[PDB]
Symmetry: C2
Subunit: 258 residues, 2 copies
């Protein structure tokens, strides 16, 4: 599997702060397209250098300069070489952009694109990068049709591998019968995907409802096609660590890759 990211950049300093993480998602032979948006930040000077940096660190890369611009950005991707694309967005602390962000997210599916929405904890950042939780939504038999969790799983596996971190699958269930089915589903997923040393937790309570989350450097969730961005922010704050939210294009088949 190779992640090909479209990364809008307004501020090159934010990009520099995210470089290693973008690299960890895409290494090896994945790709990163830097889409520079407008030039007080002198993107013209910085983007080419950062793009060359990705190449030096084993990831393919390109850059261009200049919400309507994101649509054009994705539209331009259509027949490009670097295969299925994924839109990488940062979830800001300020809510001033939630509507555009939501609109961008809604639009990305139209262009056969997955979306990664990254909510980096302002104090912890990615911490020790040694523990990853993949949160699997209450469903429990395994069809290749995993529904909206293929990108989440692929990212979990990729970061497990690039960070050499421990990975846990987390879910929740209302009843004993459902809890058992969820346990069995998680064990089957790990077994099919051939991911070793995965720990499973089936929780009594939903992560949105609980007071605390089981600790991780990074929590991976699925992103609802019609997301509550405040819910996303709340999860990160409650976790006390970084969260990433993954919306499928609908074209990924994680198991067939893994």
């Amino acid at each position: 599997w190779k992640a090909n990211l479209l990364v809008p950049v307004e501020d090159p300093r934010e990009l520099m702060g995210t470089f290693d993480f973008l690299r960890d998602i895409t290494y090896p032979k994945g790709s990163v397209k830097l889409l520079g948006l407008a030039d007080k930040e002198n993107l013209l000077s910085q983007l080419p250098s950062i793009s060359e940096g990705f190449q030096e660190e084993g990831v393919f890369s390109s850059w261009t300069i200049i919400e309507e611009n994101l649509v054009v950005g994705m539209e331009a991707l259509t027949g490009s070489f670097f295969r299925p694309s994924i839109l990488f967005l940062r979830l800001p602390e300020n809510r001033d952009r939630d509507e555009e962000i939501r609109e961008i997210i809604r639009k990305a599916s139209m262009y056969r694109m997955g979306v990664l929405l990254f909510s980096k904890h302002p104090q912890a950042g990615l911490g020790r990068q040694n523990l990853i939780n993949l949160w699997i939504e209450n469903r429990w038999d395994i069809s290749m049709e995993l529904g909206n969790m293929d990108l989440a799983l692929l990212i979990a596996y990729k970061l497990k591998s690039n960070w050499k971190a421990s990975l846990s699958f987390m879910t929740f269930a209302p009843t004993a019968i459902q809890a058992q089915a969820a346990e069995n589903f998680l064990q089957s997923l790990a077994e099919l995907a051939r991911i070793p040393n995965v720990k499973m937790q089936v929780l009594r309570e939903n992560p949105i409802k609980s007071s605390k989350l089981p600790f991780a450097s990074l929590h991976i969730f699925s992103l609802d096609p019609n997301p509550d961005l405040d819910l996303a922010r709340h999860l990160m704050e409650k976790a006390g660590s970084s969260c990433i939210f993954a919306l499928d294009s609908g074209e990924e088949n994680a198991l067939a890759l893994l």
Copy 2:
């Protein structure tokens, strides 16, 4: 050389966000003492785990729980095994604590302690950790008595080595005669300290006065015994990347180590 840090911790999430950097300063066989200050953050649960984490990652570590407390913290260090100590402080964005911070810095020298003051850029963080600038104050013959720059140099060398980053020595001079002397001093320092592949820049203007700084992942400066914390903040903002400020205990002899 082995850095033995005293690290006050009020918020374990900030500690998690700084863990790798503290490790990069102290690895290998350096040490980190976590001094937990007061318990809504449940330091009692988190500090022991983080301390064990340092040990796992090849750095010695200990922890205790509970401005007056920092003085006691350092006072307690007196005859402890882990040799010369260095106080590690974060420079917050909010100025509410500058006076206490300044007082702490002033006090640290009394206990034969160096001080590292870290100003992490809120967007760039440590970026790609591939370029380090060591800023050497306008002086130019080499005496073992480098004055207030021994800790700065040792940290530059340590991070160069642990990040496998490129290192540059930066300085400034008012006249051609002084510029030549500074060039020669920097070449001599690199040669004596046996640090290879160091690039030297002698600038026309002071870093405080210039509009922009030559780019680095991390700028290392000396910290004035009586520091202007706003000047420190300004340097980081102008740089667009992280800065660390190092005040000597006065007992370090960097060259004799390097």
